[PDB]
Symmetry: D2
Subunit: 169 residues, 4 copies
């Protein structure tokens, strides 16, 4: 298609999971849901590299032409679950890969810290993070309807479109 | 005082630095290379896990914490962040914390420190000014200890932490 | 206690916030809106100027500092950073500091806070955990003061700052 | 292509590095050590100033920018930030930008880079992945040029910048 969406929240009832679901559906992308895609904690031993899930993670990330990286803001940073998943990876999978960042925060001043955390880590693996970044609040998520609210759809639209533009370049 | 090793690798350099500090100053030690937690999932039953309970108790008990982490991809280890996701200001509020990052070289270290500092402030911890970046040259793997060159810097770090803790 | 207004704009919101704190908590006040310093150039003759001498002297004399800044382009004001460039850990070492940023809206505020935080610890200052982001809704321009909705948040900020100062 | 020297010091190392790049790739050059601006105050009259109009014009016409800055107190120079405060996304939107920071050594460099990356993204610029930290060893002051050991890295940096600009 050939885009990929990664849900960074490990909570099955997490808001980030809903945002990711919507994007994956509307824009016909691959979807990695960390709430369902449970990895072991990276520990650096050889057998972990043989793990089915680990090989799948690498495979699906490499084939992606562009990645929408979503994460909830936990303690002013990305989820430990998402960071752990990335710890299995490297520039091998991310080099020059167009990445759009989206953080789901709960409080008032939350969101930017998670984004910066993700941007720094992504740049660390030589990814190409696009300028436009998005912070979602509870008001942007329609839990009862398992989708995002109308108020945020335009922003997401622009995010994905800018990502696609960088991907074509 | 409590020392927390943020590297999940049993052979990690960060574990060596953490062990040295813990033994030299007779502190409590939480070693994430042995202290294995499930990946946070936000479930209530998970938060009731004995290990999670233990983590909370030992952190809140601590008068001061030396927080060590390797730099993985310009940030703290996922293992450490995952452990922290189980916790909150209830365990960290106003608690004196000293930051130490072990990087593989180059320009590594600061990103991990900043990541940790931001997260710790997020849980209302009292992060002291002095922060330390260790490189492979500062670690003696053969003898499973730190190199002589960094010992004074570590001493300065701990003593400043103690100063903030007693104040 | 010393309050520093980071906004160079005479009509800026940050100036209103700063003036409020200085007035109600009877503190010293450095207003970069009219405390005009030249652009740092590293020349020795600059440190001879009475304003920079005054800046250094009032910072060292302060028992605790409330550092306010607008968020310009996801960072602290150039005016404030320029003023800080004249200074160093000589004036800031272990200085209790509380951060406050004023943002135009949206997702602004945090970047300026982090910027100031990183710079402040860079000069070895003791930045307290509690930090504030003020939005237009927190500023009562018509009455040239802060809104009632933010007064006790500031109160808490000053309280925590004082606590760190006493200890 | 445009090269911006962030150091306001006429004898700054950053000025040396900037001059090397500007001459090697025959680029435009804005030298803040001699391109003096007033402290931004937000008043309409300032935008009438020749230097301000010049700054805006030369930035917009640039197809790519190499942004250099010394690390002052774990951040970009106040001189550079002040200059950027005059500008906005109107001049930087989708502009390819390569970051380079000159640090006095130690753990310095990353903080200045992060500061610049955050601010640049704040004005909607397109900051490339590759970033460079130059240290004293990478600068030959007596020869008024960069050391041979860093010439390759600088080349790779400019080449990646060109690639993103040709997109
Ligand atoms: C462990 C934990 C830490 C959190 N810390 C923050 C925070 O630092 N800032 C914030 O805005 N929200 C914070 N929240 C609230 C989340 O932003 C909120 O749950 C949001 O919906 C994203 O999380 P979710 O995708 O799992 O639902 C935290 C939530 C959890 C579970
Ligand atoms: C997954 C992973 C990512 C790493 N990324 C970085 C990096 O971003 N910057 C760096 O300086 N070193 C990096 N390294 C090297 C580590 O800093 C090095 O292993 C160091 O000894 C600390 O890790 P350790 O405690 O597990 O030994 C990375 C190592 C691993 C295993
Ligand atoms: C040059 C400039 C850049 C600005 N960039 C931002 C921004 O990055 N984020 C934001 O929330 N507000 C931004 N604003 C709006 C200010 O935050 C707003 O004016 C606020 O009141 C603080 O500035 P002040 O103290 O001068 O009033 C910017 C304002 C100016 C003058
Ligand atoms: C006001 C000031 C603050 C400085 N702070 C730092 C620092 O935070 N980290 C660092 O590595 N170097 C710092 N330095 C040293 C500079 O990195 C050094 O002068 C280097 O040559 C770059 O600055 P320059 O372009 O003016 O030469 C500082 C220098 C000055 C003048």
């Amino acid at each position: 298609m050939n885009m990929l969406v990664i849900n960074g929240t490990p909570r099955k009832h997490g808001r980030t999971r809903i945002a990711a679901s919507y994007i994956a559906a509307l824009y016909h992308t691959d979807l990695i849901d960390l709430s369902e895609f449970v990895l072991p904690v990276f520990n650096g031993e050889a057998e972990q590299s043989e793990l089915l899930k680990v090989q799948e993670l690498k495979q699906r990330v490499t084939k992606a032409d562009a990645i929408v990286l979503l994460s909830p803001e936990y303690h002013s940073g990305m989820s430990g679950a998402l960071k752990n998943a990335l710890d299995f990876l490297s520039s091998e999978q991310f080099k020059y890969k167009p990445v759009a960042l989206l953080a789901v925060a709960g409080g008032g001043d939350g969101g930017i810290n998670a984004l910066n955390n993700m941007r720094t880590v992504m740049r660390g693996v030589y990814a190409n993070v696009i300028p436009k970044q998005l912070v979602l609040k509870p008001v942007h998520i329609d839990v009862e309807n398992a989708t995002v609210a109308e108020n945020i759809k335009e922003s997401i639209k622009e995010l994905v479109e800018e990502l696609s533009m960088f991907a074509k370049a």
